[PDB]
Amino acid sequence: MNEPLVFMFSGQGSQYYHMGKELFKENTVFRQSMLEMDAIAARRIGTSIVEEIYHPGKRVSDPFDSILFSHPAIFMIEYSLYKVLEDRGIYPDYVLGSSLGEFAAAAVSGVSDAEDMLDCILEQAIIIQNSCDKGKMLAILDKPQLLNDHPQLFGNSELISINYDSHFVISGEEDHIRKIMEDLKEKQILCQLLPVSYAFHSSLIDPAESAYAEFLRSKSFQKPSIPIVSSLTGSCLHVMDENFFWNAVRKPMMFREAIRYLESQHTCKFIDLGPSGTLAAFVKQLIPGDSADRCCSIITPFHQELKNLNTVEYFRTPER
Amino acid sequence: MNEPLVFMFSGQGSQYYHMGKELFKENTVFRQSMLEMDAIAARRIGTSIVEEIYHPGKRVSDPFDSILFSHPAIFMIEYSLYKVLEDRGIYPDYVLGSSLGEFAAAAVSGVSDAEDMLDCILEQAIIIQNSCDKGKMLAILDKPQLLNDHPQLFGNSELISINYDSHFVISGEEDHIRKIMEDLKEKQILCQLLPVSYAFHSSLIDPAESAYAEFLRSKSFQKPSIPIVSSLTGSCLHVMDENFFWNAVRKPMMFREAIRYLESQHTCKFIDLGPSGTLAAFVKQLIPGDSADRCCSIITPFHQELKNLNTVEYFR
Ligand SMILES: [Zn+2]
C-alpha cells in the first residue's frame, strides 16, 4: 500500500532562536511566506517577528520564551515550511497538531486560512500576556510512574503530557516548578525546563479563557478537508467544537494515543514540520526500532534543512 | 439539534422482496434514481433488477438470495434513498458502511460515483457466482460466549460478526451450517438463516479474489470527502488500500467497535438507510436504553417509508 504522509506540528516549547535560518536565506518560498506573515504580525506586536527570530546577538541556547514573539514565530515557521513542501509536490495525507501546532495543522487542513489563524495566535498571546501570571513547564526525563509512587514530589504542578515511556511534562507556577527541580535533583531524577514563560496546558492560564472565547465567537471556521489528528483528543477530528482553539493550549495532551491511532490502520510516514524535531523524536520512541526510517524532521539546531529536505524526497508516493 | 447525523448502510442479508415499494411508486426522486440504475445494471445482467425486486409472484418471506439481483438491489435501494434525503436537505455528517453497504457509503462520501460503484458490485456478484461454491450464513440469537464455552457446536464455520450481546453471525458450507442448526436446536438455542446463497465474509468466497482484484486494478477511486466509519476497520477511514472493496465482502466485521468509536467523540443520531432497519436495531442494543429515539429506520417490511421520512426530518 502507499504509506500515508503525516505532517506533524509542534507547539510551545520547541522554538529556538535562528530556527530555519538556512531556509530563510536559501529558499524563496520559505522567505516570502515568512515575510508575508511578518507584516501581519508586526501590525499587532509592534515590531518584526522575523528580526527577533534571527537577531544576531541571541543564540540557540538563549531560551526563546517571550509569548508575544514565540506564538507567532512557531506558526510562521511551520506554515512557511508547509508551503515549501507543497510547492515541491509533497502533500500530507494527514496533519497532526500538538499544542500551538494545532493552529498550523488547522490552517493546512483548510479549517481557516493562514492569515486568520495567525491572527487567532496573535490574539491569544496578547490576551494571555495581559491576564495571566507567568509560569513554567518542566520535562521529566524519567518514568511517569513516579507521579503515582511519589506524588508529593510533584505537588503544586499539573501533568500535561506523557510523550513516551521515559518523557513527560508538568506545568506550574515559577517557584513551585523551581522547588520541584530542587527536589528532583536530590532524587537524581533528570529534568529540563521548556523555553516557555507560561504554565500552558494547566489551570494557571484560565484567566484568559473568557476573553479568548469571546474573541473566538467573532470568527468562522471551515470543516477540515485534510484529515486532522489532534493531540487534544488523541484521534481524528471532523466535527470541531467552538472552544477547540482554546483547548489547544489549555487541555492536557494525548500524543501517544494520536500516534497509536495512526499506526493502527496503516504504517505511516512521519514528517516533523515543527522546530527542533520534537515530535519525530517522540514518534521514534513509540514505534519499532527498525522503523526509525519512517520518521524524519527538517528544522533542527543542526541547521541542515536543505539536506533534510533531500531526505524527505524519498518519502514521495509512487505513481502507477 | 447539533449532534451529528450518521447515515448507516447494511449489506447482504438485509434485503427482501418488495423493499421500499411505496417509495418506488410515490417518490419521484427515489423512483427516478432506481430506474436510472436499473438501465445501467440491465446492460450487464441482461434483465431488469427492479422487476425482480418487485416480482409480483414473490413475498417478503421468500428469501431474496439470487446474488446477481440481491447485490445490485441493496446498493440501488440504499443510494436511491440517500438521494431522497439529500433532496430534502437532510445531509450526513458521517456515513457508516456494513458489508455490501460500504459500497453505498463510499459512493455517498465521494469515493466513487454511483454508476461506477454499481459496476463494481455487479462484477462482484458475477465473479462470485462464476467461481465460488454456494454457502449459508446463520444469525444466532444468543450470547457470543457460546463460541468459547462450546466451540464444538460451531465447527466448520467462521465467525463473521458480533452485533450485540445476543446476536452474532457465522458463515460456512451449506451442509455444515445445516448441521450446526440441528445441534443448536437440541440445545434450544434460537437461530435464523440469512437470505443469502453464499458464505459471505468467509474464506469460502476466496476463489473470487484474484479475478475481482484484477478487475479492481482497472478502477481509480477518489479520497473520501464525507467522513466514512467502516465496519471493516471499526474506525474512521481515510486512506483505502487496493483491496478495500474486496474486504468489504470478505473480512469479518467490527460493527460494535465502529458504533463505540462514534459515541466516543460525540452523541450521534443514527439513520438506517439499509433495508429492514437491521443496523438501527443493533445500535439500540449498543447505546443506553434512554437513547432509543436517536435511532431511526426507514425501509421496513411494514412499508411505512413515507411516515418514517416525516419522523427523520425532525433530526437535522
Ligand atoms: Zn477520521
Curated annotation (Swiss-Prot), chain A:
It comes from the Bacteria. InterPro entries: Ac_transferase_dom_sf, Acyl_transferase_dom, Acyl_Trfase/lysoPLipase, Malonyl_transacylase_ACP-bd, Polyketide_Synthase. One of its GO terms (cellular component) is cytoplasm. The active site is at 99. GO terms for biological process: antibiotic biosynthetic process. GO terms for molecular function: acyltransferase activity. This is Polyketide biosynthesis acyltransferase homolog PksD. The lineage of its organism: Bacteria, Bacillati, Bacillota, Bacilli, Bacillales.
